[PDB]
Amino acid sequence: ALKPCEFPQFKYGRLYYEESLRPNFPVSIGNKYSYKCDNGFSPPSGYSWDYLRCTAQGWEPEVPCVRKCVFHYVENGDSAYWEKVYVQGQSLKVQCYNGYSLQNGQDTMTCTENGWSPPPKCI
């Protein structure tokens, strides 16, 4: 069987069980391995862990761990009741109060490589 996927090493995270598994590589298309990301980062799905999949295009995702932005508290705005995870590239509309705003027309925040932009502070 073809074994085209080498031991996956990527930024801001790692496979679980890296030492029981590293010698098993390379592996075949269809195999998958659980992984986690560093604090402040997340799989694109926004879950606490996810699968790295050996595909015909190599490992997917290409960038397994991306910036994580948590939505919860908004100063002078509407806060949520529990922490909602967002990932790099996602955006939401924040509800500001009493003539305060995020100063970007639509009161939208985007999860960027360096966190929320602008921050969840209505001014």
Residue numbers in the entry: 339 to 461
What did the publication describing this PDB structure actually write?
Factor H binding protein (fHbp) is a 27 kDa surface lipoprotein consisting of two β-barrels that promotes resistance against complement mediated lysis and is a key meningococcal antigen that elicits SBAs. Here we characterised members of the three variant families by identifying amino acids that are critical for fH binding and through structural analysis, to inform future vaccine design and to understand the basis of the interaction of fHbp with fH. Here we show that even though V1, 2 and V3 fHbps exhibit remarkably conserved atomic structures, differences in key amino acids necessary for interactions with fH are only revealed by functional studies.
As fHbp binds human (hfH) but not murine fH (mfH), novel models are required to assess the efficacy of fHbp-based vaccines. Therefore to develop a physiologically relevant model to test non-functional fHbp vaccines, we sought to define the basis of the binding of fHbp to hfH but not mfH. Alignment of the amino acid sequences of hfH and mfH revealed multiple residues located at the site of interaction with fHbp that differ between the two species. Therefore, we next humanised 13 residues in mfH that span the region corresponding to the interaction site of hfH with fHbp. However this extensive replacement of residues was not sufficient to enable mfH to bind fHbp at appreciable levels as demonstrated by far Western analysis; PPX, the meningococcal exo-polyphosphatase was used as a control on blots. The overall CCP folds are conserved despite many sequence differences between the two species throughout the two structures, including the surface where hfH interacts with fHbp. Additionally the arrangement of CCPs 6 and 7 in mfH with respect to each other is distinct from hfH, distorting the entire shape of the potential interface with fHbp. We also demonstrate that impaired binding of the murine fH to fHbp is not solely due to amino acid differences at the binding site; structural analyses revealed a different orientation of CCPs 6 with 7 in the human and murine molecules that would sterically inhibit interactions with mfH. The chimeric fH consists of mfH CCPs 1–5 and 9–20 (enabling interaction with murine C3b and other complement components), flanking hfH CCPs 6–8 (allowing binding to fHbp).
